[PDB]
């Protein structure tokens, strides 16, 4: 081991090698607290650099405690705080993050990197171009991660291909965090320049799949990007304006900080469009009215603001247009605000990428096995995530259907008793005026009596139409939701846990291969166990991807195909009921005036 | 290492020592699959025993594959399937299970142990008295645990204190799984007999806290038992009738199997009593009607069947009494069926045990440190579980209040428009009969007119009472739920995750102490790091138990104290509205007959 005047560390504790220094895990000699010790191996310029960096204090900067001296040799050490969870490389090498971070973790990364950038620029420290190795991770005091910046002042794909802050590396870091792959990929330091130089405007990625072929340019996030559409619309102009090929037209830092702070100060409202079967995340400020909420729902569900009918926990929801967005009800992903229209739409469903398993290569290649295990485990993790999303859509669909039938029945009942009131008034006016004429006679009498007989015949038509509508809405009729508990997948079938067991077995084999890759060669029995695990991994992958596409996707497509025709039948019934309600209001508008003239003729004679 | 003709194992793989055999983890020589090998160290009686046990096949029996012979020495081995997750001792030594298993895991243990007992008895295998070391655990193909029985055919507390199956050890196993402690505990093999011999009827535990003092006998599960009340009522007679002190009066196996199968075939319905703020789990068969459901709600919430008003997702719930219990709606713990009455009750809340931290002992005792770490981590785990339960009660309380106000407003609105209808009819009858009398005169007339003037005055009182009720139900009035978003704890405060971080640090120190207990003595620096961890554990425990009782319990008691007076105000308003509705029905019942007599007097003159 080695030591300083106040710290000591064992040399079998190497947190990091490097051509400049070595980072060990050591501990304070009198209190036992852990630290990371950076030992150099080789002057007051760098001492004044570390003295300026010592005075910083922020929750996104790794603290430098003290700079001391080795006791055996006269080297320099830096004592800094110990971040146990590794850097952002270790976050992005997990197989669940092989197709991009989840959206909450992505927003945490975005917030903390931009906050560290701002606090370094505001004091005046000229730093490097930060990459995913300069971003450490720590577990905060409330479970959430906290990302910190360190070492400011393949590691070569993140640079621009040539005092002012350059923002290419931050853009490639955020595209890599959002999707899991680098934006500009040649096939298999001049090809990079030839790709990025001939890049069009607005393009944020370019893929080359052949040798020296043309480059497929793209302007959207890929289909296997886990970020919601409401965030991709806010995030794609930022990455389109900082990954610009010409440095004159980029943003610089103040416009970038203002636009990312406009992204970060939004709240989220979860809205599940029922006729399209699609969930949405509307990002809105805390001080916007309901008018901007209706415009944001229009931009994603294509429903005009005068047709959006909102449902929240049973009853309807009537947002008056002066209601601020911080006084909306609290929504989660499993408790959304359902949007139903009256005019027809297209039932889309969930749009996901079709990912297949790669071909396993049969040779005993001890470096290729770790890459094969990582790629196959990433495919099965993507399938598990899509399986849970499909189950969530089916459950919200069943709940929204069950609420919408009750709202239809309430409109039915108020129409029924309003009609019964108009019926009582009509029959009284008939009986009154006819008794008065038949007694008084020992003009406009036929003009009254013919029209009121017409109204009673119209009433007779309205009543049998209401009987037919009750015959359809009855439990056991044509618009009952007894089919919805008999298709799709239910949470008692436990499909996601069955994928998760196979996924845990595959992740264990992946960790064993990655551990066996660091040791250069193995013994006899260890090599045989390695080969048996190599084929058993692919057996688990075949089993899980058969279960996914023959238990989860097929039943979902059956459920979607029935939901389409249920929505068509619902829209037909809900239009006919509105026609009957308007006809009853027309009869009431006539009956009022005729009743007035009847009562006047009663009083004058 | 050692070997057989088809299996091999390294000797640094000892799954278990014993005075009879040694259990190693080995693997099949041609396919690489893992097995557990039991090597004896010492005849056809036991060979025929193992041949009879070889033919069994059940999902609660550990499979015996083959019996073979060591190649070096001529010993015997048993190859059986490898259960990686350990026995039930390893399940009950976890600090989260220090006060009993969760209820779902307890029902899994109960089902699988009784199923293994039945399948062994039905074939005719005479086995031992099974204890928690004879119950292995495996992870099934869908995430749930599967408990299996092995080795049939402090380990001495589970025996009776003296062909027919004895059931004392099963009873002590289930009491230990439910509560985490043995039922009969002397203080610090004759005292056990003197306690259990003088045991009264029905008692399932007896605690002695002094030297040779009297024994506190109990007939209930303790207050820190995590099992719900609806299960304790079903489970306490079983344990009271198999822990009987006299072997003549015990059940035997058929009555025990029938009663535990009556427990195991129940479904669960989650019901949250709102006026008492208590959640309940009603256990009901799949073929019972709604009448038995109302009787089971009466037995726990003390609400008579003619007063239970049920609320489920917004609207009410009217269970017709011929509706089977498998056609009820599906409920979870976060989606219950709310029960509200009209007559007052007592707001109880959650009843939990007050557990404090034990005194840390300052001496360097390397066996006492593991016990101290286990006991302190068990206390903080119990506190984390109670914190999550308190947060669940506050969230369900906020949701039930928000729904109940809407139901009150719906009763208000139907009363209002029914009254407006009766007002129109009354004013027409007044105007008609008075115009007819004033014109006809160029009897009972004052008897009509005085009474109808009384009815209009009564109407005038009804209208201002309805205006006062709308003034109270208005947003911003006296019966608004604006207080409920300003007290208690919210899920955005993240108190449970703040306890969970401290709990993870404490569990890591506990595992390090348990690892250091197996090594008999330590070096210098290792002993110093041990002492610093010993005091840092108690620092984390003090921090977590201060945060619990000053952030979680105090805000909960404020929320409970406001909910009591809100429930009192709600019951007062909801009674006055019913009085107004009945008065309007009385006025309508009078107005109908008076209108008939008015119309007859219109027609006759």
């Amino acid at each position: 081991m080695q030591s300083t005047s106040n710290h000591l560390w064992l040399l079998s504790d190497i947190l990091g090698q490097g051509a400049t220094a070595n980072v060990f895990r050591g501990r304070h000699k009198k209190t036992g607290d852990l630290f990371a010790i950076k030992v150099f191996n080789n002057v007051d310029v760098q001492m004044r650099e570390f003295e300026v960096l010592k005075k910083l204090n922020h929750k996104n900067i790794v603290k430098l405690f003290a700079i001391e001296e080795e006791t055996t040799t006269r080297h320099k050490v830096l004592i800094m705080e110990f971040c146990p969870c590794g850097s952002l490389y270790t976050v992005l090498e997990e197989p669940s993050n092989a197709y991009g971070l989840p959206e909450s973790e992505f927003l945490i990364v975005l917030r903390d990197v931009v906050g560290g950038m701002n606090h370094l620029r505001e004091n005046g420290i000229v730093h490097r171009n930060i990459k995913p190795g300069n971003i450490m991770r720590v577990i905060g005091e409330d479970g959430q991660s906290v990302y910190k910046l360190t070492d400011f002042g393949g590691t070569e794909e993140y640079l621009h291909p040539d005092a002012t802050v350059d923002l290419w590396s931050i853009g490639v870091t955020f595209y890599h965090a959002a999707t899991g792959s680098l934006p500009f990929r040649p096939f298999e330091k001049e090809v990079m320049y030839k790709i990025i130089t001939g890049k069009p405007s607005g393009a944020i990625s370019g893929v080359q799949k052949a040798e020296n072929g043309p480059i497929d340019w793209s302007g959207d996030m890929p289909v296997s990007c886990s970020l919601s559409r409401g965030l991709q619309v806010l995030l794609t102009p930022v990455l389109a304006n900082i990954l610009e090929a010409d440095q004159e037209k980029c943003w610089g830092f103040d416009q970038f900080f203002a636009e990312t702070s406009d992204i970060l100060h939004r709240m989220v409202i979860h809205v599940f469009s029922l006729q399209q079967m699609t969930a949405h995340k509307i990002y809105i400020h805390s001080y916007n009215t309901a008018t901007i909420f209706h415009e944001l729902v229009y931009k994603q569900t294509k429903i005009i603001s005068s047709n959006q009918e909102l449902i929240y926990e049973g009853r309807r929801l009537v947002l008056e247009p002066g209601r601020l967005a911080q006084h909306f009800p609290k929504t989660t992903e499993e408790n959304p605000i359902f949007v139903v229209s009256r005019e027809p739409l297209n039932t889309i469903g969930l749009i996901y990428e079709k990912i297949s398993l790669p071909k396993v290569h049969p040779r005993y290649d001890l470096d290729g096995d770790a890459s094969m295990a990582k790629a196959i485990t990433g495919v099965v993790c993507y399938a598990c995530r899509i399986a849970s999303t499909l189950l969530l859509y089916q459950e919200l669909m069943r709940k929204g259907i069950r609420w919408l039938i009750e709202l239809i029945k309430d409109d039915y009942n108020e129409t029924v008793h309003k009609k019964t009131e108009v019926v009582i008034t009509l029959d009284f006016c008939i009986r009154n005026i006819e008794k008065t004429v038949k007694v008084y006679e020992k003009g406009e009498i036929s003009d009254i009596h013919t029209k009121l007989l017409r109204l009673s015949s119209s009433q007779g038509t309205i009543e049998t139409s209401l009987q037919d509508i009750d015959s359809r809405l009855s439990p056991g009729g044509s618009l009952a939701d007894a089919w919805a508990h008999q298709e799709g997948t239910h949470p008692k079938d436990r499909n996601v846990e069955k994928l998760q067991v196979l996924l845990n077995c595959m992740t264990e084999i992946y960790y064993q291969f990655k551990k066996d890759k660091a040791e250069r060669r193995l013994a006899y029995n260890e090599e045989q166990i390695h080969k048996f695990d190599k084929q058993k991994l692919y057996y688990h992958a075949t089993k899980a991807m058969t279960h996914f596409t023959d238990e989860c996707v097929k039943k979902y497509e059956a459920f979607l195909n029935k939901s389409e025709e249920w929505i068509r039948k619902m829209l037909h019934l809900r239009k006919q009921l509105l026609s009957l309600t308007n006809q009853c209001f027309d009869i009431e508008e006539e009956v009022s005036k005729y009743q007035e003239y009847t009562n006047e003729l009663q009083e004058t004679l | 290492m050692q070997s057989t003709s088809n299996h091999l194992w390294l000797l640094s793989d000892i799954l278990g020592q014993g005075a009879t055999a040694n259990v190693f983890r080995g693997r099949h020589k041609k396919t690489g699959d893992l097995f557990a090998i039991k090597v004896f160290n010492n005849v056809d009686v036991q060979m025929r025993e193992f041949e009879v046990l070889k033919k069994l096949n059940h999902k609660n029996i550990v499979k015996l594959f083959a019996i073979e012979e060591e190649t070096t020495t001529r010993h015997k081995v048993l190859i059986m399937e490898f259960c990686p997750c350990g026995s039930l001792y390893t399940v009950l030594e976890e600090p989260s299970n220090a006060y009993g298993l969760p209820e779902s895991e307890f029902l899994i243990v109960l089902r699988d142990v009784v199923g293994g007992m039945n399948h062994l008895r039905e074939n005719g295998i005479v086995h031992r008295n099974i204890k928690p070391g004879n119950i292995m655990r495996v992870i099934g193909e869908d995430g749930q645990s599967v408990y299996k029985l092995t080795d049939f055919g402090g380990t001495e507390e589970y025996l009776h204190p003296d062909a027919t199956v004895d059931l004392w050890s099963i009873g002590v196993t289930f009491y230990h799984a439910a509560t985490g402690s043995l039922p009969f505990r002397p203080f610090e093999k004759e005292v056990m007999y003197k306690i259990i011999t003088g045991k009264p009827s029905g008692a399932i535990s007896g605690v002695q806290k002094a030297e040779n003092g009297p024994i506190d006998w109990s007939g209930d599960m303790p207050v820190s038992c995590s099992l719900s009340r609806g299960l304790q009522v079903l489970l306490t007679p079983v344990l009271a009738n198999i822990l009987e002190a006299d072997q003549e009066k015990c059940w035997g196996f058929d009555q025990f199997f029938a009663e535990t199968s009556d427990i195991l075939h129940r479904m669960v319905i989650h019901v949250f009593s709102l006026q008492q703020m208590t959640a309940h789990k009603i256990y009901i068969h799949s073929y019972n009607t709604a009448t038995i459901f109302h009787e089971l709600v009466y037995k726990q919430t003390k609400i008579i069947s003619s007063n239970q008003e049920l609320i489920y997702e917004g609207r009410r719930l009217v269970l017709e009494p011929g509706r089977l219990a498998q056609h009820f709606p599906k409920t979870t713990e976060e989606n219950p069926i709310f029960v509200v009455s009209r007559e007052p009750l007592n707001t109880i809340g959650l009843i939990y045990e007050k557990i404090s931290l034990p005194k840390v002992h300052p001496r360097y005792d390397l066996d006492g440190d593991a016990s101290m770490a286990k006991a302190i981590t068990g206390v903080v785990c119990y506190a984390c579980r109670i914190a999550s339960t308190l947060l669940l009660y506050q969230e369900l309380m906020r949701k039930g209040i928000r729904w109940l106000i809407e139901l009150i407003k719906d009763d208000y609105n139907e009363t209002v428009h029914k009254k407006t209808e009766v007002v129109i009819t009354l004013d027409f009858c007044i105007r008609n009969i008075e115009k007819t009398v004033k014109v006809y005169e160029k009897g009972e007339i004052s008897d009509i007119h005085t009474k109808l003037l009384r009815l209009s005055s009564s109407q005038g009182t009804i209208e201002t009472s309805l205006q006062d009720i709308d003034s109270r139900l208005s947003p911003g009035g006296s019966l608004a739920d604006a207080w409920a978003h300003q007290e208690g704890t919210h899920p955005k405060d993240r108190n449970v995750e703040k306890l969970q971080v401290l709990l993870n640090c404490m569990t890591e120190i506990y595992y390090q102490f348990k690892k250091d207990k197996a090594e008999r003595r330590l070096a210098y620096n290792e002993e110093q790091i041990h002492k610093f961890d010993k005091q840092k554990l108690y620092y984390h425990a003090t921090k977590a138990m201060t945060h619990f009782t000053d952030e979680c319990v105090k805000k909960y008691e404020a929320f409970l104290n406001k909910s009591e007076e809100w429930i009192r105000k709600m019951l007062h308003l909801r009674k006055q509205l019913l009085s107004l509705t009945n008065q309007c029905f009385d006025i309508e019942e009078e107005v109908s007959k008076y209108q008939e007599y008015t119309n007859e007097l219109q027609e006759t003159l």
């Binding site: 029995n525 045989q528 | 020589k29 041609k30």
Partner: peptide
């Protein structure tokens, strides 16, 4: 390439 059975030697 293919796995061959284990041995104790």
């Amino acid at each position: 390439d293919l796995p061959q059975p284990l041995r104790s030697d």
